[PDB]
Design an enzyme around this catalytic site. Structure first.
Site, mmCIF file in Angstrom:
data_model
loop_
_atom_site.group_PDB
_atom_site.id
_atom_site.type_symbol
_atom_site.label_atom_id
_atom_site.label_comp_id
_atom_site.label_asym_id
_atom_site.label_seq_id
_atom_site.Cartn_x
_atom_site.Cartn_y
_atom_site.Cartn_z
ATOM 1 N N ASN A 1 -21.503 -13.651 -15.949
ATOM 2 C CA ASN A 1 -20.487 -13.027 -16.683
ATOM 3 C C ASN A 1 -20.283 -13.774 -18.008
ATOM 4 O OD1 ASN A 1 -18.081 -11.896 -17.349
ATOM 5 N ND2 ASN A 1 -16.676 -13.364 -16.263
ATOM 6 N N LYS B 1 -18.914 -13.086 -20.525
ATOM 7 C CA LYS B 1 -17.676 -12.754 -21.135
ATOM 8 C C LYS B 1 -17.840 -12.511 -22.642
ATOM 9 C CE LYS B 1 -15.484 -15.779 -17.768
ATOM 10 N NZ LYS B 1 -14.004 -15.580 -18.024
ATOM 11 N N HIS C 1 -11.965 -7.590 -12.910
ATOM 12 C CA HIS C 1 -11.986 -9.029 -13.216
ATOM 13 C C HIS C 1 -10.497 -9.386 -13.532
ATOM 14 C CE1 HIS C 1 -12.994 -12.811 -15.060
ATOM 15 N NE2 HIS C 1 -14.289 -12.739 -14.527
ATOM 16 N N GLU D 1 -9.517 -11.049 -15.754
ATOM 17 C CA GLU D 1 -9.334 -10.933 -17.257
ATOM 18 C C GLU D 1 -8.930 -9.546 -17.654
ATOM 19 O OE1 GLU D 1 -12.747 -13.418 -18.593
ATOM 20 O OE2 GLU D 1 -11.265 -14.873 -17.765
ATOM 21 N N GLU E 1 -12.588 -14.343 -6.162
ATOM 22 C CA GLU E 1 -12.259 -15.171 -7.321
ATOM 23 C C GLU E 1 -10.724 -15.493 -7.497
ATOM 24 O OE1 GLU E 1 -14.238 -13.427 -10.596
ATOM 25 O OE2 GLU E 1 -15.947 -14.830 -10.229
ATOM 26 N N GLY F 1 -12.383 -20.602 -14.908
ATOM 27 C CA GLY F 1 -12.623 -21.520 -15.927
ATOM 28 C C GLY F 1 -11.697 -22.639 -16.164
ATOM 29 N N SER G 1 -15.037 -21.392 -11.316
ATOM 30 C CA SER G 1 -15.648 -22.698 -11.696
ATOM 31 C C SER G 1 -16.815 -23.101 -10.733
ATOM 32 C CB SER G 1 -14.698 -23.922 -11.720
ATOM 33 O OG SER G 1 -13.847 -23.923 -12.820
#
Lengths: 247, 247
Positions: A9, A11, A94, A96, A164, A170, A210
């Site tokens: 990913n 991103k 996701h 995000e 996740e 991250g 991570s």
């Protein structure tokens, strides 16, 4: 739940100039044949990638899509273009998108089913916030979000669940193999009682949060961690370390 | 004079073949000079587009991008990647994002901002909903919409404002050339000593809201109606008609 699956990913990161690295490095690489890894690049170089790709394992996917395949949707991504352009997967829900973009379960749930309608692969993203953790049930959240899909998607033959934790995306806080694997069974248990266990046996449930070259091996014999969805280091040369760790 | 711009926004439409036929017809239809067309396909068909255009009078753009040029925003488009792939423009602020994708004056603002920062123009859509209109606020709306940018943007050398009545996009219901000229005109002023006469003068104001080959010619002699944002009609030959009727 079988074939080791590794996603990257990227991103909002990249240059054609730079994905050339990525993907060339990837083509060059000693990785098993009993693998399946997809590169989820920025929507603009999803066809450049496709054209750079010279390794059977790897396939290109997308960062996001709409639930409609054509229309008055200024600024969206169409599963039909992505396929049309080469890509085979699409990431959905996701974190995000769920926090930055106020993308609800339901949207994520029409998105999902539709795309499988069109015959694209869906990497479904689920997880919990540091807050749900501490409130204990984490498993609500993932089942509240995983239901939103079930109502709609009967045949999962194509979905790869990616577990996740929002606190690990991250942040350098990977989850421990053992609470990670723990969460997965549940998931697998979950879906078992619904998708039926031959399904849940074949469903692939991934870990992201991570995952870095270095901690990959730490996970190498866990039963319910059948892969990764790697963001951050899917960028580094160390992405390949992840795929070559046997988990 | 103070140069004709006819923007073609594909929304969620194009195929590598649609995009090309589109692209070659333009590549091959006599419709010149002081005309500037910036065509805008999906993120997905962006690089191919150029490749086929590049930039005589024909330039490409993207339907949307986010406010940071890189980072962890799954799904997003990055000024910097549309720049890299040879794109020159970015529709920012259209009615579609704004309603369904709920981005707002301040959002739009900070992105028109970051956007030109990288030296890419913006196609700043401003527009009034069918209520606005009756409660006679389109002066207000537009002027508020626009203020919110203005409060972050100083230099508008590379901004092109798309005035799109919210009831004329996709409905057939074009604005009459009258009010057409009225409102553009009005904000050339408000826009006037926000930033001076020169600017108000070299700057274009697009009209959009079911703009097409036929009705196109009716804004012929409208100083202040410096062109249009064609959704629907950019997918056909009429596009060509639309940039052969002058201003």
């Amino acid at each position: 739940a079988r074939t080791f699956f590794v996603g990257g990913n990227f991103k909002l990161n990249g240059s054609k100039q730079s994905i050339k690295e990525i993907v060339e490095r990837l083509n060059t690489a000693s990785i098993p044949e009993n693998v399946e890894v997809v590169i989820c690049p920025p929507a603009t170089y999803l066809d450049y990638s496709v054209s750079l790709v010279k390794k059977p394992q790897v396939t290109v996917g997308a960062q996001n899509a709409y639930l409609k395949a054509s229309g008055a949707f200024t600024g969206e991504n169409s599963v039909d273009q992505i396929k049309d352009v080469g890509a085979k997967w699409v990431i959905l829900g996701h974190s995000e998108r769920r926090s930055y973009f106020h993308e609800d379960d339901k949207f994520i749930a029409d998105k999902t089913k539709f795309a499988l309608g069109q015959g694209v692969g869906v990497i479904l993203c689920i997880g919990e916030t540091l807050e749900e953790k501490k409130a204990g049930k984490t498993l609500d959240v993932v089942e509240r979000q995983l239901n939103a899909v079930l109502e709609e998607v009967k045949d999962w033959t194509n979905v790869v669940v990616a577990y996740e934790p929002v606190w690990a995306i991250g942040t350098g806080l990977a989850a421990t193999p053992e609470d990670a694997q723990d969460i997965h069974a549940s998931i697998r248990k979950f879906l078992a009682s619904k998708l039926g266990d031959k399904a849940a046996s074949e469903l692939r449930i991934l870990y992201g949060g991570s995952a870095n070259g270095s901690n990959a091996v730490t996970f190498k014999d866990k039963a319910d961690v059948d892969g990764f969805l790697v963001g951050g280091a899917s960028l580094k040369p160390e992405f390949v370390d992840i795929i070559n760790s046997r988990n």
